[PDB]
A and B are shown apart, each in its own frame.
With several copies, the nearest count.
Chain A
Amino acid sequence: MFFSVVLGLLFLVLFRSVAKKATSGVPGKFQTAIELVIGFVNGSVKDMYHGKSKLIAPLALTIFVWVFLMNLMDLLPIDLLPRVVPSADVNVTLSMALGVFILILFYSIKMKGIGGFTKELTLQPFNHWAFIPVNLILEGVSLLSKPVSLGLRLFGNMYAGELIFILIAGLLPWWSQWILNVPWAIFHILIITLQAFIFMVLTIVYLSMAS
């Protein structure tokens, strides 16, 4: 399944690269040019923590950092020239790990805190408040689906964006247009990844505050 299996292979490779690069450069050096940046990441990540802060701080902190790292993999395909069947269903694959992991995440806070021991009680006087079950139920379902809908929607929006900018650039015989698009699209991409970490933080600060 080249156009398929080759794709999952690709995204898997990126994720591994994240894993090893972590401990490897982390034992060293960083050093200082490197150290200071690591400070931006970790410390800005701490300011971000406050807000959700303590609950997932190891769990979510490690995660979001890994999310920037793994998220850069798409920038790599954009960075390539700056032909597929890695990155199409490797991008679908990332949308699946991320969005699937998000549906998983609602549960992970659910059991991790109540939250979910209390989430079964979500109906509550809230379904009585608001006395109709249609309101509370449509709301909660729209929430669980909506978390997946939002996160997956962002993921696929990103992957698709990659595919499209790629198309515009590659088909055209004239290079200049492809360049301007690709540069603008590149700023776009970086913004998108940071926006992703922010989105994880948004779902998470949700979780701390959510119910």
Chain B
Amino acid sequence: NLNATILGQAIAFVLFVLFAMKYVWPPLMAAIEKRQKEIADGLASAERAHKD
């Protein structure tokens, strides 16, 4: 006879915001950072190799 479902949804959103933000961000960061880091590292070390 209480609202209380708002409360439940909130607590779930807490644990799940931790779980959700955490897992994706380390990987997703590694990912976008991986595409960019790919062009970059290849280009920089590459330039070194070619010139030397």
Task: State which of B5, B11, B20, B32 has its C-beta within 8 Å of the C-beta of A66.
Answer: B20
**Would A22 and B2 count as touching, CB distance under 8 A?**
no
Stretch touching chain B among A87-95, A134-142, A158-166, A198-206: A87-95
A-contact 0/1 string along B13-29, CB 8 Å cutoff: 11111011101111110
Residues of A within 8 Å of B24, CB to CB, are 22-23, 26, 62
Residues of B within 8 Å of A26, CB to CB, are 23-24, 27-28, 31-32
Min Cβ gap A97→B in Å is: 3
**Would A175 and B32 count as touching, CB distance under 8 A?**
no
**Would A169 and B20 count as touching, CB distance under 8 A?**
no
Min Cβ gap A73→B in Å is: 10
**Would B3 and A175 count as touching, CB distance under 8 A?**
yes
Residues of A within 8 Å of B28, CB to CB, are 22-23, 26, 33, 36-38
Residues of B within 8 Å of A97, CB to CB, are 6, 9-10, 13-14
Stretch touching chain B among A6-14, A47-55, A125-133, A146-154: A6-14
Q: Count how many chain A residues have C-beta atoms less than 8 Å from C-beta atoms of the other chain.
A: 59
Residues of A within 8 Å of B16, CB to CB, are 15-16, 18-19, 22, 66, 70
**Would A175 and B12 count as touching, CB distance under 8 A?**
no
- Cα–Cα distance between A35 and B31 once the two chains are bound (Å): 9
Task: State which of B2, B5, B12, B27 has its C-beta within 8 Å of the C-beta of A16.
Answer: B12
- Cα–Cα distance between A10 and B16 once the two chains are bound (Å): 14
A1 within 8 A of B: yes
B-contact 0/1 string along A86-114, CB 8 Å cutoff: 00111011101100110000000000000
Task: State which of B9, B14, B27, B32 has its C-beta within 8 Å of the C-beta of A35.
Answer: B32
**Would B7 and A32 count as touching, CB distance under 8 A?**
no
Given contacts A27-B31, A96-B10, contact A4 B20 (CB under 8 A): no
- Cα–Cα distance between A6 and B11 once the two chains are bound (Å): 15
* Extra inter-chain contacts (12) besides given A22-B16, A58-B25, CB under 8 Å: A1-B4, A8-B7, A19-B15, A22-B19, A36-B28, A58-B21, A66-B17, A81-B6, A81-B9, A90-B1, A174-B1, A175-B4
Q: Which residues of B line the A interface, CB within 8 A?
A: 1-17, 19-21, 23-28, 31-32, 35-36
Q: Which residues of A line the B interface, CB within 8 A?
A: 1, 3-16, 18-20, 22-23, 26-28, 30, 32-33, 35-39, 42, 58, 62-63, 65-66, 70, 81-82, 88-90, 92-94, 96-97, 100-101, 169, 173-176, 178-179, 182-183
